């Protein structure tokens, strides 16, 4: 709404300035405005959108984890009663986090995904959908936790199916999707074996296709392959 009077190109320009200034909330608001113009996003623009919201929600998740840890300690035997404040403030942060996730999911549903026909765009958006449901799942404790988890799984699975058919095994989007879906398995779905298998198979199939790549594509793919290895090392 607030960005309705600003030109699309000016919103994109400002998102880039906001990134340089490390003003990620501003960057996300600019990119939301740009999406709401209704035109499809280019590759560069999709990456601006993802960076902005990743940084905003990343900060909320880190804060939530600090507060949840304090709250869990408060519920241990021998802890002194300090009143409702820790729970209240964790809830406040949580609600704000959920709001950001709902905003992103809303942009994807209205109407980024449905207009995305090329494999690279569609997989990118479906990965995002999986990621923001995963963030919702991290904080979910009630009747809908299972459905939230399944929503993440379904989005990731659709993305995986497209990526395997349409993209090479070194494609950075396909690699990043696999990295994150593997973490979903380990941290959310209580499926560490699936997580490890996915990471390993993804790494090995990428390794086998590196020979096809330019120097610059090699750099991009090997970076994410190293993240897969890092997780495998953490988990084995």
């Amino acid at each position: 709404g607030a960005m309705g009077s600003m030109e699309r190109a000016s919103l994109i320009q400002k998102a880039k300035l906001a990134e340089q200034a490390e003003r990620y909330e501003d960057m996300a608001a600019f990119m939301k405005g740009a999406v709401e113009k209704g035109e499809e996003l280019s590759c560069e623009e999709r990456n601006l959108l993802s960076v902005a919201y990743k940084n905003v929600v990343g900060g909320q998740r880190a804060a939530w984890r600090v507060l949840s840890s304090i709250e869990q300690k408060s519920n241990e035997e021998g802890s002194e009663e300090k009143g409702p404040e820790v729970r209240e403030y964790r809830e406040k942060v949580e609600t704000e986090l959920q709001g950001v996730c709902d905003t992103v999911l809303g942009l994807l549903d209205s109407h980024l995904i449905k207009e995305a026909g090329d494999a690279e765009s569609r997989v990118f958006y479906l990965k995002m959908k999986g990621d923001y449901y995963r963030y919702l799942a991290e904080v979910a404790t009630g009747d809908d936790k299972k459905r939230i988890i399944d929503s993440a799984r379904s989005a990731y699975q659709e993305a995986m199916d497209i990526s395997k058919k349409e993209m090479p095994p070194t494609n950075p989007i396909r690699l990043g999707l696999a990295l994150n879906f593997s973490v979903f398995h380990y941290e959310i779905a209580n499926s560490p074996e699936e997580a490890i298998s996915l990471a390993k198979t993804t790494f090995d199939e990428a390794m086998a296709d590196l020979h096809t790549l330019s120097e610059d594509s090699y750099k991009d793919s090997t970076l994410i392959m190293q993240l897969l290895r890092d997780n495998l090392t953490l988990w084995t």
Partner: peptide, 5 residues
């Protein structure tokens, strides 16, 4: 915490 992108 594990790596995601």
């Amino acid at each position: 915490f594990p790596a995601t992108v």
